[PDB]
Design a binder for this molecule. Sequence first.
Ligand SMILES: Cc1cccc(O)c1
Ligand SMILES: Cc1cccc(O)c1
Ligand SMILES: Cc1cccc(O)c1
Ligand SMILES: Cc1cccc(O)c1
Ligand SMILES: Cc1cccc(O)c1
Ligand SMILES: Cc1cccc(O)c1
Ligand SMILES: [Cl-]
Ligand SMILES: [Cl-]
Ligand SMILES: [Zn+2]
Ligand SMILES: [Zn+2]
Lengths: 30, 29, 30, 29, 29, 30, 21, 21, 21, 21, 21, 21
Amino acid sequence: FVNQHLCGSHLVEALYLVCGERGFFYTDKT
Amino acid sequence: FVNQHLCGSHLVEALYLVCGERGFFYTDK
Amino acid sequence: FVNQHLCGSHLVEALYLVCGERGFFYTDKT
Amino acid sequence: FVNQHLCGSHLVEALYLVCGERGFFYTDK
Amino acid sequence: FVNQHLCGSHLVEALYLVCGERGFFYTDK
Amino acid sequence: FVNQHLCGSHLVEALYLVCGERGFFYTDKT
Amino acid sequence: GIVEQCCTSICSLYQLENYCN
Amino acid sequence: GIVEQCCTSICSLYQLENYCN
Amino acid sequence: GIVEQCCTSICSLYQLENYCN
Amino acid sequence: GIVEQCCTSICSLYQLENYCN
Amino acid sequence: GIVEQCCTSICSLYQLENYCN
Amino acid sequence: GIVEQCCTSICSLYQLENYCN
Ligand SMILES: Cc1cccc(O)c1
Ligand SMILES: Cc1cccc(O)c1
Ligand SMILES: Cc1cccc(O)c1
Ligand SMILES: Cc1cccc(O)c1
Ligand SMILES: Cc1cccc(O)c1
Ligand SMILES: Cc1cccc(O)c1
Ligand SMILES: [Cl-]
Ligand SMILES: [Cl-]
Ligand SMILES: [Zn+2]
Ligand SMILES: [Zn+2]
């Protein structure tokens, strides 16, 4: 897997791919 | 199962833009 | 809606989503 | 109406790359 | 030929993320 | 064609579009 | 859900905001 | 233009809509 | 238009440049 | 190949890593 | 959060998975 | 390589094509 800053849309795309059928939660900033 | 899978890739990028700092959940079933 | 710098492809994708059936014009730099 | 809508998402990203500083219009009808 | 073409756009972005520094080839036929 | 830094996923998308049926090879960093 | 609603037909950004939070 | 408004600075939704047809 | 031409079949970057400006 | 395998049905990141290098 | 972990710093795959449901 | 040519510097189309098969 990439060793990269993942931000904005790229971060969400990565979660989408990584999480598969579980889906995910995106808080944006905390 | 791609067409829905490919569709969901766009949906998540769209929700990112529209929800911004509110964020969102992405899951069903 | 995001409070973000939107540049390059992200800017176009945002316009595409925002403008809907109207469509849009992209000048790039002016 | 998604397949054409999803297609247009790619088309606009492609036109961005190909047209560069010339830019482009995206509209019909 | 779009649906496979559009599919391949996602596949290449996915492979980018998964392969990272190993990289990959994208070609057939 | 754009006069831009093309990095990460954008670089791959650009190669995908540019190379067409030939396809391509992505080394990431060398 | 979002997939049944927004993959068959187009959801606008207005439609999509329904799915925020 | 859009680049100078929304890329170099940050644009609002309303600001982004000025570039719709 | 671009959608009829490039969503049914693949438009190359050459095809697509036709739609620039 | 990757297209026959991952465009008909979903390839997970695990499936996809098979195509690395 | 995810932004502060994976965007401002770099996250591992494992780290990214903490944000799956 | 491509990263060092087109990401750290800017590549031309022609330059980008050196990475096609
Ligand atoms: C619609 C749907 C089903 C299953 C998992 C998901 O993340 C989304
Ligand atoms: C092809 C098409 C139809 C309607 C609106 C658009 O932006 C594009
Ligand atoms: C699957 C496939 C066929 C032809 C060219 C490619 O880059 C990929
Ligand atoms: C913005 C967007 C993406 C994908 C499907 C939709 O209905 C709307
Ligand atoms: C680059 C591209 C995107 C979408 C459709 C096409 O025909 C070509
Ligand atoms: C991540 C991904 C993209 C496109 C097709 C797939 O099967 C999987
Ligand atoms: Cl970026
Ligand atoms: Cl698609
Ligand atoms: Zn798509
Ligand atoms: Zn980006």
